[PDB]
């Protein structure tokens, strides 16, 4: 509020927040769809939904939106959930 | 980045430094990982001692000397040894020792007789 | 001339986790037993040797340890709140 760098950082932090929010919302939607598909009980749609969701997860990990460990945990959980079914 | 800095000691008029290895984020007089020499600029030849092997180790792991420490490392030849450009030549101008008090005592006694 | 594409890490010796020997005083929990550990220090001022007792909660999978058995424990990462010990074996039943 008092220092030029702070005002510039206000704007830039806002734009970064918008981007991160979009990425996280997309990831959450993909996970939700996959979970619903597994709940339905069909394997093939769950199969390539898992593939697409894993790709989205580690691609978001590359962007820095989520930590690579978080992507690994989510991928492992989804794969184990599919394997159990 | 771990750096090889100079911390300040001594009293107000006479700064005497220690060549310390410390993180760049710590304060000047903060905790030090290691002490690898000392540097007293107040003397006429400005005594410099650097423990060569520890300096070599810390340069090997990637510590970054500050400008005064870089100048000192060049003077003692440690920097050149680490790089290897002209060789490892000691340019250190050691302080010239002062004759013993006993020498002067006997000299005065003989001068009397 | 080329350096190796893989650099094996410098091996690090494993640490020594704390061990203890005690008596079971409670086994009303699933996979959990409560052990009584005794320590004998000296009084910091009066010098006498003082015997103090302490309760720790260990984890045994199959629950082979009853009440009153001299069991052996080894420290571990937090398995739950308050649970930091793993049952090694029963030295002598009672």
């Amino acid at each position: 509020a008092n220092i030029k760098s702070q005002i510039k950082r206000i704007r830039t932090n806002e734009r970064r927040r918008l981007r991160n929010q979009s990425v996280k919302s997309s990831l959450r939607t993909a996970i939700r769809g996959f979970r619903e598909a597994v709940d339905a009980g069909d394997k093939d749609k769950a199969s390539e939904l898992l593939h697409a969701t894993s790709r989205k997860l580690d691609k978001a990990a590359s962007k820095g939106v989520i930590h690579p460990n978080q992507a690994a945990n989510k991928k492992s959980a989804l794969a184990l959930a599919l394997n159990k079914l | 980045a771990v750096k090889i800095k100079l911390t300040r000691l001594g009293k107000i008029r006479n700064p005497q430094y220690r060549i310390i290895v410390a993180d760049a984020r710590t304060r000047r007089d903060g905790r030090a990982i290691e002490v690898i020499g000392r540097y007293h600029p107040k003397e006429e030849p400005s005594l410099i001692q650097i423990d060569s092997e520890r300096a070599q180790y810390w340069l090997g792991v990637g510590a970054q000397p500050t400008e005064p420490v870089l100048a000192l490392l060049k003077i003692t030849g440690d920097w050149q040894k680490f790089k290897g450009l002209p060789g490892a030549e000691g340019t250190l101008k050691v302080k010239e020792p002062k004759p013993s008090k006993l020498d002067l005592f006997n000299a005065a006694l003989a001068e009397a007789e | 001339q080329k350096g190796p594409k893989y650099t094996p890490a410098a091996e690090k010796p494993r640490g020594r986790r704390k061990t203890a020997i005690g008596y079971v005083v409670s086994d009303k929990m699933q996979k959990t037993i409560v052990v009584e550990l005794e320590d004998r220090k000296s009084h910091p001022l009066y010098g006498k040797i003082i015997r103090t007792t302490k309760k720790v909660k260990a984890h045994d999978e199959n629950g082979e340890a009853g009440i009153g058995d001299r069991v052996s424990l080894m420290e571990t990462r937090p398995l739950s709140a308050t649970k930091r010990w793993r049952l090694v074996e029963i030295l002598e039943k009672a």
């Binding site: - | 002067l104 005592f105 005065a108 006694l109 | -």
Partner: protein, 200 residues
């Protein structure tokens, strides 16, 4: 600071002569003032205090400096009494006085404080300067012709130079072989009384 008042007062009060050759003390060897003749009550504290006053008014050392000296002497691994005596004797002004270059300790202190001397090639004007082994005390060339040093250099028949000191040059150089021991000190009073007083 310094003590500048009459010197004979302290000698009369302490019952001994501290200057060394003063006639007034011999004329009246009793304490000053109106009641210098009254009999005194005897007390160990009084004797110890008077011994300390003798020591610190012979050498012209104030109480705080004397206490520092006593602490230093006690800390040393010898014995306290002679350690204190040797520390007192190692002062530059005392060295100048015992070297026969000053009639009295006061004038030795005045000469030192005025920077008329020079120790180890560097000018020193500090009466409390302590002198170590193989120390060469010299008079600077400018003041060699002054009347004080003149009459000091032509009356070298007074009090003998102690063993630990030795004047070697016709210009009255001083050499210090080692710090004096209790045998060669040759001082009045009793060190044990001072040690007792400072342990109270």
């Amino acid at each position: 600071a310094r003590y500048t008042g009459p010197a004979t007062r302290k000698s009369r009060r302490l019952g001994v002569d501290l200057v060394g050759g003063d006639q007034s003390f011999e004329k009246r060897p009793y304490p000053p003032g109106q009641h210098g003749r009254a009999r005194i009550k005897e007390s160990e504290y009084r004797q110890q205090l008077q011994e300390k006053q003798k020591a610190r008014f012979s050498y012209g050392v104030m109480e705080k400096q004397f206490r520092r000296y006593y602490e230093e002497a006690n800390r040393q691994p010898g014995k306290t009494g002679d350690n204190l005596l040797r520390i007192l004797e190692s002062r530059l002004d005392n060295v100048v006085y015992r070297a026969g270059l000053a009639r009295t300790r006061r004038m030795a202190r005045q000469l030192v404080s005025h920077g008329h001397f020079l120790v180890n090639g560097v000018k020193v004007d500090i009466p409390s300067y302590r002198v170590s082994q193989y120390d060469i005390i010299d008079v600077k060339e400018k003041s060699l012709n002054t009347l004080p040093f003149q009459i000091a250099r032509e009356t070298a028949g007074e009090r003998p130079i102690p063993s630990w000191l030795q004047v070697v040059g016709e210009r009255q150089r001083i050499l210090v072989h080692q710090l004096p021991e209790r045998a060669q000190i040759d001082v009045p009073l009793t060190e044990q009384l001072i040690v007792e007083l400072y342990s109270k």
